[PDB]
Design a protein around this ligand. Structure first.
Ligand SMILES: [Zn+2]
Ligand SMILES: [Zn+2]
Lengths: 203, 452, 56, 474, 65
């Protein structure tokens, strides 16, 4: 009926995911959760013709936007979109509405991974997840005011992996996001992968 | 309307034809959109898991506030043959359609698509400069043909035979003109996506030949919905049947092939408009003295305004017209009922009558708060005049048929009259006058009743 | 930063040059925001996402 | 045409497709559409600059219709005549039409404006001691007046007193229209009057607008002002008499209107009863002052029957007195055969036609331009209804189905007897009885109109109600 | 059970009166009289009597010029 907006907050932290890999019996779990996210986004875009997708990652040294791609794409050498530098990660016989969004997001994933590898020498003691879904609600309101209506929803791909405990700086911004999401009636969905059973603030 | 219409059409599809239709991922993706959101959610939840899920789990999934919606979705998916109901362990086990599930998973997980989405040849133009006005011209050609205004360009014979076999667009060649039915202006009521949908369901009701199958037509229209505008596609994936309908809707303008037998066909914006939707042009002004001031510049809006409004002049902004009696007579001799014209006036009213209408409704509620009145966007004087013209069209009504009289016994008259009343063909009866009349459609039934 | 809307060029004319750059910097994090982001972060939200992306 | 190809849909317009007029980009603030075919003006009241547009058009055009949203106006000759009489030039009007309209003003419209507005005020009608003179500022117009020579012995010639309307219509059908404008400020032959409005009398803004249409440039202009009943057209007559301050004669349809108008002068303005006079059957005595006022009936003057010697002397006095103003109340009866002559027998400088019903079944209502003058002011009925000046009437039409026997006898009857039959159907009896019964319970005073004497008597004897027809005692 | 192929009409008694004087004008218009609202009109002249009745009510209405 009424289309919605699927905003997704991805928590990428090399320490968290690699401690999940060490605690688990497998290596490369983030590839699995990444392709699961991709088929989820395809399912969401299959749900309705006009619903939209936003995905945001919260890496160690800040946050970056994964889909939709930054507006620096200018059909130049630094366009980095569509056929320009279209490195074959997903098959080209894909549905084009799925193909464009998935190929763009995986290219942005590889670019973020390259940038984070380039700054692997510095270990951040600050987690950028709370500001990440803060900007998620900000883009939610951007879509809501630009398009007249449209629903919205958040997905949180968080990971504890038994290494990061419940932090104290993640108290105030999380409830700021709670009140903001309650203002625009945006549900907040959180899935936590790791050995830590309970995350009280996210609950 | 639209979703209900295509759902009832695909209800008419046989189960084996539906199962063959579920082969392509594009068809499964298209029909996935046509399910209700509860139905869509349950189907996609059933897609990824090979194990079959009992119906009690799905019933427990739904809150009590949406039990009716859940039952309606169950009815829709059962009628759509997407479920295999299984009877095991005293439970009505439910399994998804396997071909549908596999094709939809391939459409999601990037599996086998067999080029159901077409292939891009990377030679293309912009839609606005070439494709958009071509689609507009090809649509307006058949529109201005069917409204009856003279044209320098007339469409092909295929759409003419389609309109002849259609319920609308009655044709006469001994006179030399094309008569518009009520269903014609009903077609002009809805917006062009559902217009295209009704056109294509009438097309599928037309095409029964051995030259054309059915699943290929549905595959082609659903991939045309799946195609994107601004990139050409190669004709090789289509069958020769799908190629001759590619030519057929190239004549329609749904697709722009720049020349016949070319290998590159360009999707037009009507292809994306077909799936789902998204002061205006055609917004008109009516007064107490039946005057028409239409903010319209497209020829189609003022062309369909010409059928029921005596147009006096036309500016670059306005079309000066007047609702005369004779224009309304021209409408009603086409079968165009008055209420539909009233609805057309309501949908095309200017926002200034809208603000004055909410103003007078505010005055009505501040004067008589005990009662509430509907928002009459246009004054009731012109509406009353149109209704009086409609009533004076049919001051006398002439029902034709047969009448039985001359009964020497009252029981024979009573038995024949109650037989006519039971089959619902009697129009009048009285034992004093010893006469009763029956309709023309009920003449033959009562005649064979009396003969036997 | 918070909604990645393209900042409008919003050039008045060629002789009118560039005026009213819609980027709103935050003094604690040096992150630019648009007008809608400013009028969202300052009453509905109460955190600066730029102040939070900073790895302190 | 402005290089615009006709469309397939444009064929249903009988050369009225004005789409060649190019849309202006700033057309949202422009509330006007100008039709080049006939000068019809389409005005939107909801748009910005609406009141400027509406008072500009009522200065320059006649309103064909004024509904709520879109108003219809007609550019005619007489509206332009009045506009240039009160001081509006051609190019200013053309410029503000160009500024206030979306579509550009076509060449035919500008040609019509310039053709109508120019050559106006050339011929002027003046009265010098009850003798009509046409005065022209240019000499060759006298030579152009060579066809209907009705001369009777600066550039002027005398006209026969009964041929003045023929001269006016001759001048109207030529491009030099006749002008009369009483300059009472520069008039010293006729003695002035001390008539002035009482300080306790209040005047309404639409009456002031009508007077400003009449008293526009600085001279008293003859013409027609129509107002609703109860809007105070009598007050406009009183105020016009107080403005001109010259000798005023009032012609009324009825003697009761004569005494009512005399009461209006005695009540609303500072006019002494020795300055006011009555010409009727019972009353024929007049003011002895050098300038005063008289109210009389139309058939005082225009009756050709054998009259009294007193009435003979009175009408000789009226003919021998030069009047500066005449108030022709209920002007729609003036185009009758006798009543047309009262503007020629009575030589008055300014003629004001006051009425509420400016419509006739025959076409002689159009001749009042030759009789009185151009149409000055039209009062908006809905505007006066909404602001509490005239009542909010609910016009209704009650459909009485004709009964079977009455219709059966009705289909073979002659026309006068046809009316006699369909007026007396019982369904109208029941409808009128119910309406009287219901609205009497509403505390509403009801007046039931029925022209036939037999009809009103039958209804009144059926319901036991009073009836007043023609031969009832006074 | 004798069948006559006729067209019943439903109208007010005024239209019934009009079509009965049309019957009084020319022979085969209405066959028998049934009620004050129901008459059996000959089916071969349905559009014909419509063409008379709309013409009759044309003088009943005023058409402004
Ligand atoms: Zn922003
Ligand atoms: Zn900050």
């Amino acid at each position: 009926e009424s289309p919605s907006l699927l905003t997704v907050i991805i928590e990428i932290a090399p320490k968290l995911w690699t401690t999940f890999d060490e605690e688990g019996n497998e290596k490369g779990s983030i590839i699995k959760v990444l392709e699961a996210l991709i088929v989820f986004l395809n399912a969401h875009l299959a749900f309705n013709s006009a619903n939209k997708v936003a995905v945001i990652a919260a890496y160690s040294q800040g946050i970056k936007y994964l889909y939709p791609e930054s507006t620096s794409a200018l059909k130049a050498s630094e366009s980095e979109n569509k056929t320009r530098s279209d490195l074959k990660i997903i098959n080209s016989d894909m549905y084009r509405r799925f193909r464009n969004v998935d190929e763009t997001l995986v290219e942005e994933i590889y670019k973020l991974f390259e940038l984070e590898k380039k700054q692997i020498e510095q270990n951040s003691q600050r987690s950028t997840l709370a500001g990440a879904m803060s900007a998620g609600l900000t883009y939610v309101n951007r879509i809501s005011k630009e398009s007249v209506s449209l629903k919205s929803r958040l997905l949180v791909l968080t990971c504890g992996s038994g290494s990061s405990k419940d932090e104290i700086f993640q108290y105030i911004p999380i409830m700021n996001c709670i009140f903001s999401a309650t203002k625009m009636k945006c549900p907040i969905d959180v899935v936590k992968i790791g050995g830590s059973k309970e995350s009280t603030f996210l609950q | 309307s639209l979703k209900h219409s295509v759902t009832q059409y695909l209800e008419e599809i046989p189960q084996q034809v539906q199962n063959r239709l579920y082969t392509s991922p594009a068809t499964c993706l298209a029909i996935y959109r046509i399910l209700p959101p509860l139905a869509k959610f349950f189907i996609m939840a059933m897609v990824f898991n090979e194990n079959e899920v009992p119906l009690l789990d799905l019933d427990k999934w739904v809150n009590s506030n949406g039990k009716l919606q859940f039952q309606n979705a169950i009815k829709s998916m059962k009628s759509l043959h997407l479920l295999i109901p299984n009877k095991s362990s005293g439970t009505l086990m439910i399994n998804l359609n396997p071909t549908f599930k596999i094709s939809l998973r391939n459409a999601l997980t990037g599996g086998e698509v067999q080029n159901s989405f077409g292939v891009v040849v990377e030679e293309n133009v912009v839609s606005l400069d070439l494709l958009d006005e071509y689609s507009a011209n090809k649509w307006e050609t058949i529109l201005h043909f069917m409204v009856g205004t003279p044209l320098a360009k007339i469409p092909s014979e295929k759409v003419l035979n389609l309109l002849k076999h259609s319920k609308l667009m009655e044709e006469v060649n001994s006179t030399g003109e094309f008569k518009i039915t009520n269903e014609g202006f009903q077609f002009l009521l809805q917006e062009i996506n559902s217009q295209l949908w009704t056109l294509l369901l009438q097309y599928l009701k037309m095409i029964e030949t051995s030259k054309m199958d059915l699943v290929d037509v549905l595959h082609f229209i659903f991939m045309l919905g799946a195609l994107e505008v601004g990139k050409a596609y190669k004709i090789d994936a289509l069958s020769e049947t799908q190629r001759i309908m590619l030519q057929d809707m190239r004549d329609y303008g749904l697709v722009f092939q720049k020349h016949s037998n070319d290998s590159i066909f360009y999707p037009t914006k009507l292809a994306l408009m077909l799936t789902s939707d998204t002061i205006p042009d055609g917004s008109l002004i009516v007064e107490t003295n039946f005057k028409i001031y239409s903010y319209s510049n497209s020829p189609l809006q003022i062309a369909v305004l010409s059928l029921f409004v005596h147009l006096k002049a036309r500016f670059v902004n306005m079309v000066l017209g007047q609702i005369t009696r004779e224009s309304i007579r021209r409408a009603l001799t086409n079968g165009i009922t008055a209420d539909q014209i009233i609805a057309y006036l309501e949908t095309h009213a200017h926002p200034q009558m809208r603000r004055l209408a909410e103003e007078k409704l505010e005055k009505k509620l501040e004067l008589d708060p005990n009662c509430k009145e509907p928002l009459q966007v246009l004054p009731p004087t012109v509406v009353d005049q149109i209704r009086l013209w409609q009533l004076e069209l049919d001051r006398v009504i002439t029902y034709e048929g047969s009448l039985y009289s001359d009964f020497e016994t009252s029981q024979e008259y009573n038995l024949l009259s109650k037989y006519a009343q039971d089959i619902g063909v009697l129009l009048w009866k009285d034992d004093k006058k010893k006469k009763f009349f029956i309709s023309k459609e009920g003449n033959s039934q009562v005649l064979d009743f009396a003969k036997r | 930063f918070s909604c990645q809307s393209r900042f409008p060029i919003l050039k008045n004319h060629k002789n009118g040059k560039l005026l009213t750059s819609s980027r709103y910097r935050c003094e604690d994090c040096k992150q630019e925001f648009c007008v809608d982001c400013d009028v969202f972060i300052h009453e509905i939200l109460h955190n600066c996402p730029g102040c939070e992306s900073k790895p302190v | 045409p402005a290089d615009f190809v006709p469309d397939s849909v444009s064929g249903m317009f009988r050369s009225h497709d004005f789409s060649y007029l190019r849309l202006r980009p700033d057309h949202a603030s422009r509330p006007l559409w100008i039709s080049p075919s006939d000068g019809r003006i389409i005005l939107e009241s909801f748009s910005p600059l609406a009141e400027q547009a509406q008072d500009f058009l009522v200065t320059i055009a006649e309103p064909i219709s004024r509904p709520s949203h879109i108003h219809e106006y007609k550019i005619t000759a007489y509206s332009l005549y009045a506009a240039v009489s009160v001081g509006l030039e051609t190019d200013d009007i053309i410029s503000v039409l160009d500024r206030l309209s979306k579509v550009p003003v076509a060449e035919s419209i500008i040609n019509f404006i310039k053709g109508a507005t120019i050559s106006y005020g050339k011929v002027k009608l003046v009265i010098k001691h009850n003798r009509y003179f046409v005065e022209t500022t240019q000499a060759d117009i006298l030579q152009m007046l060579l066809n209907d020579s009705v001369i009777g012995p600066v550039h002027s010639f005398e006209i026969a007193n009964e041929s003045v309307e023929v001269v006016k219509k001759r001048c109207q059908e030529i491009d030099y229209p006749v002008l009369e404008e009483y300059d009472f400020r520069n008039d010293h032959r006729n003695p002035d009057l001390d008539i002035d409005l009482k300080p306790s009398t209040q005047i309404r803004p639409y009456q002031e607008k009508s007077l400003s249409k009449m008293f526009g440039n600085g001279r008293a202009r003859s013409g027609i002002i129509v107002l609703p009943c109860g809007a105070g057209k009598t007050l406009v007559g009183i105020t016009a008499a107080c403005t001109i301050k010259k000798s005023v004669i009032v012609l009324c349809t009825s003697s009761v209107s004569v005494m009512q108008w005399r009461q209006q002068f005695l009540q609303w303005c500072t006019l002494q009863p020795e300055n006011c006079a009555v010409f009727t059957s019972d009353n024929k005595e007049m003011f002895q002052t050098e300038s005063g006022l008289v109210v009389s009936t139309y058939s005082m003057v225009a009756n050709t029957r054998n009259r009294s010697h007193d009435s003979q002397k009175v009408m000789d006095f009226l003919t021998g007195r030069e009047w500066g103003f005449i108030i022709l109340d209920e002007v729609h009866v003036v185009p009758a055969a006798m009543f047309r002559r009262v503007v020629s027998t009575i030589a008055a400088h300014a003629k004001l036609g006051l009425t509420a019903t400016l419509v006739r079944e025959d076409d002689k209502i159009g001749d009042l331009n030759f009789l009185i003058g151009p149409k000055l002011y039209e009062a908006n009925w809905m505007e006066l209804s909404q602001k509490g000046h005239i009542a909010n009437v609910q016009c209704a039409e009650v459909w009485c189905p004709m009964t079977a026997e009455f219709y059966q006898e009705y289909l073979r009857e002659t026309a006068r007897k046809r009316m006699l039959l369909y007026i007396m159907n019982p369904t109208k009896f029941q409808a009128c009885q119910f309406l009287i019964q219901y609205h009497e319970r509403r505390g509403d005073k009801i007046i039931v109109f029925s022209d036939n004497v037999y009809a009103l008597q039958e209804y009144a004897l059926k319901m036991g109600k009073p009836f007043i027809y023609g031969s009832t005692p006074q | 059970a004798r069948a006559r192929k006729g067209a019943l009409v439903q109208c007010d008694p005024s239209i019934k009166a009009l079509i009965l004087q049309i019957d009084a004008k020319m022979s085969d218009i209405v066959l028998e009289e049934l009620d004050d609202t129901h008459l059996l009109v000959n089916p071969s002249k349905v559009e014909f009597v419509k063409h008379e009745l709309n013409r009759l009510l044309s003088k009943n209405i005023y058409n402004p010029m």
